[PDB]
């Protein structure tokens, strides 16, 4: 059970830790989050009370180092930092715990939600999508654009999601135009799975990461990537049976977790209608079709 | 974006462009089977690919053999159209390749875009214009070469005959679209108007009769009359 101490909380802020969130008051004696489950990536995220613009946050894995948050009054944000001195860090956390100035990661024992959302998400893959190699943790915010968005402008601050484009030479073999456009199996299985991702676990990890960035930060490019990776599978006639079963589970937990009031901006009508009702896999996503029909029948 | 009434003169500028009409690619007769079910029998079709500035028509004849043993033919017909237009562009010298291809039907956009990925600088555009190119098969000489084809064939025409010697490509296109609109609205009447006077013939190397400038004005008047009448009937107005 790992800990992310906070130096202080000088500005009023809503703090997220994975799917949970807490309001902290200006100069409230808040000194961090304890009992963070080992074995998963986590995201700690912020929305300032005075500027509900720029949700931002940090993907991290407590197995990779000792991380803490400290407010920077110059850049005006809560920054994640690594403490390289083990004994200083242990002594900081022990003191804050003894004074009970930390919130406890509020996981219910029965509750597999976070595992279910991050099953395939690895820090090493996050750090290749979010390039800042001097840190072990990854900063994301509402405004960061994707490599794909940038092609259609500061490359250092980009989300390097795998570019998916259904009307690209990558997606379409010369001489198989109609075949490859109407059945994306070539593109899914040869180009993306065998060629780029190497396996379905890496593909799902990027899909899950894109969703979480869309949900937690309202990152529009992330939402585009999540939908494109769903659509590429649903538009393929030939998908491994384990992949379809796993996709159905992944999407079910994503749709279950999405705030009801954000379905309007986070769910693409065309993609979901095509995926559940027209696509090759219209009948392969039973759990997802059932939760979508009971939670968001308007969209459909 | 879309080609409309606003940007109509763009058709007659010096940027090579082609219209592509796929209406006549997949043609069938619907008939009863012995068992009283319904079946289709394909007939020869054609891609209508037209340079509106020069009148150069690339009539790719679609022989019924291309449909043999294929499924979802109305879908295939769009992709076959896109394949053949892509093949035509690749066959043209670079300086003859179009900068834009305008499709008369929006369903041709994705098929043509995917076939033309190798040509990212050729713009594929829809049009808001309701162009009467479906009536191409009412031009006797084009109908004849399509129906007689025993194999896939490309036939080259100038759909304006020698009109550009006397009129601009704006006026030539306006005459063509009026003639085709007439032929589309009442084929029998339109053909009657075009041939009624036996002294005005079609040259062996032409599609339309050899009208004088004055005879064209009469003809064009008679076509406008035909179109307005028909319209009053269609709508009772």
CATH class of the largest domain in chain B: Alpha Beta
The most extensive contact between chains is:
A-B, 9 and 12 residues
Number of domains of chain A: 2
CATH architectural type of the largest domain in chain B:
2-Layer Sandwich
User: Can you give the helix content of chain A as a percent range?
Assistant: 40-55%
Could you tell me how far the N terminus lies from the C terminus of chain A, measured between alpha carbons in angstroms?
A: 42 Å
Question: Which class best fits the helix and strand makeup of chain B?
Answer: alpha/beta
User: Class of the largest domain in chain A in CATH?
Assistant: Mainly Alpha
Quaternary organization: heterodimer
Structure description:
The complex is a heterodimer of chains A (300) and B (237). With 300 residues, chain A is an alpha+beta fold. Chain A has 2 domains: 1-143, Substrate Binding Domain Of DNAk, Chain A, domain 1, CATH 2.60.34; 144-300, Aar2, C-terminal domain-like (Serine Threonine Protein Phosphatase 5, Tetratricopeptide repeat, Alpha Horseshoe), CATH 1.25.40.550. Chain A has helices spanning 86-98, 113-118, 123-129, 147-151, 177-182, 185-197, 200-217, 220-234, 241-257, 263-266, 269-278, 286-295; strands at residues 2-5, 13-17, 20-24, 32-36, 42-48, 56-60, 67-72, 77-82, 103-104, 138-141. The radius of gyration of chain A is 20 Å and the shape is elongated. With 237 residues, chain B is α/β, with parallel strands linked by helices. Chain B has 2 domains: 9-163, 2-Layer Sandwich (Nucleotidyltransferase, domain 5); 164-237, Acyl-CoA Binding Protein. Chain B has 6 helices and 8 strands. In chain B, strand 6, helix 2 (109-115) and strand 7 (123-126) form a beta-alpha-beta unit. In chain B, helix 1 packs across helix 2 (109-115) and helix 4 (169-185) crosses helix 5 (187-195). The radius of gyration of chain B is 19 Å and the shape is globular. Chains A and B meet through helix 5 of A and helix 1 and helix 2 of B.
């Amino acid at each position: 059970m790992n800990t992310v101490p906070f130096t202080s909380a000088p500005i009023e802020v809503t703090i997220g830790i994975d799917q949970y969130s807490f309001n902290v008051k200006e100069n409230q004696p808040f000194h961090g989050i304890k009992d963070i489950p080992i074995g998963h990536v986590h995201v700690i995220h912020f929305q300032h009370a005075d500027n509900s613009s720029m949700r931002y946050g940090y993907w991290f894995d407590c197995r990779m180092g000792n991380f803490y948050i400290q407010y920077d009054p110059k850049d005006g944000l809560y920054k994640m930092m690594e403490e390289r001195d083990g004994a200083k860090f242990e002594n900081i956390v022990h003191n804050f715990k003894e004074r009970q100035m930390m919130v406890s990661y509020p996981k219910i024992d029965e509750d597999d939600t976070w595992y279910n959302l991050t099953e395939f998400v690895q820090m090493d893959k996050i750090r290749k999508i979010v390039r800042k190699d001097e840190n072990q943790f990854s900063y994301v915010d509402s405004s960061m654009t994707t490599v794909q968005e940038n092609e259609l402008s500061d490359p250092a601050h980009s989300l390097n999601y795998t570019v998916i484009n259904f009307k690209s030479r990558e997606a379409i073999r010369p001489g198989h135009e109609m075949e490859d456009f109407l059945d994306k199996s070539y593109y899914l299985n040869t180009v993306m799975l065998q060629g780029i991702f190497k396996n379905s676990s890496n593909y799902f990890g990027e899909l899950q990461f894109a969703f979480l960035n869309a949900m937690f930060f309202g990152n529009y490019g992330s939402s585009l990537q999540w939908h494109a990776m769903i659509e590429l599978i649903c538009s393929s006639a030939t998908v491994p049976k384990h992949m379809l079963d796993k996709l159905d589970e992944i999407l079910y937990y994503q749709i279950k977790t999405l705030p009801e009031q954000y379905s309007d901006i986070l769910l693409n009508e065309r993609v979901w209608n095509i995926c559940l009702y027209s696509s090759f896999q219209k009948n392969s996503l039973h759990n997802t079709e059932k939760i979508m029909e009971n939670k968001y029948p308007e969209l459909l | 974006g879309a080609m409309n009434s606003s940007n109509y003169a763009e058709l007659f500028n010096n940027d090579i462009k082609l219209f592509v009409d796929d209406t006549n690619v997949y043609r069938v007769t619907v008939h009863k089977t012995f068992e009283g079910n319904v079946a289709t029998k394909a007939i020869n079709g054609c891609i209508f690919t037209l340079n509106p500035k020069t009148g150069h028509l690339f009539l790719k004849i679609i022989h019924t053999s291309v449909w043999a043993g294929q499924k979802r033919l109305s879908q295939l017909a769009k992709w076959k159209t896109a394949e053949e237009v892509s093949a035509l562009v690749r066959s043209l010298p670079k300086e003859e390749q179009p900068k834009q291809i305008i499709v008369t039907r929006k369903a041709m956009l994705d098929p043509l875009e995917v076939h033309m990925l190798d040509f990212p600088n050729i713009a594929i555009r829809p049009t808001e214009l309701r162009l009467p190119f479906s009536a191409a098969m009412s031009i006797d000489k084009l109908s004849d070469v399509v129906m007689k084809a025993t194999e896939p064939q490309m036939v080259l025409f100038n759909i304006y005959d020698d009109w550009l010697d006397r009129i601009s490509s704006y006026t030539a296109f306006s005459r063509l679209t009026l003639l085709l609109r007439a032929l589309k609205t009442n084929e029998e009447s339109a053909k009657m108007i075009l041939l009624s006077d036996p002294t005005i013939t079609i040259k062996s190397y032409h599609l339309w009769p050899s009208f004088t400038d004055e005879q064209w004005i009469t003809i064009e008047s008679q076509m406008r009359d035909l179109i307005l009448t028909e319209y009053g009937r269609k709508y009772n107005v």
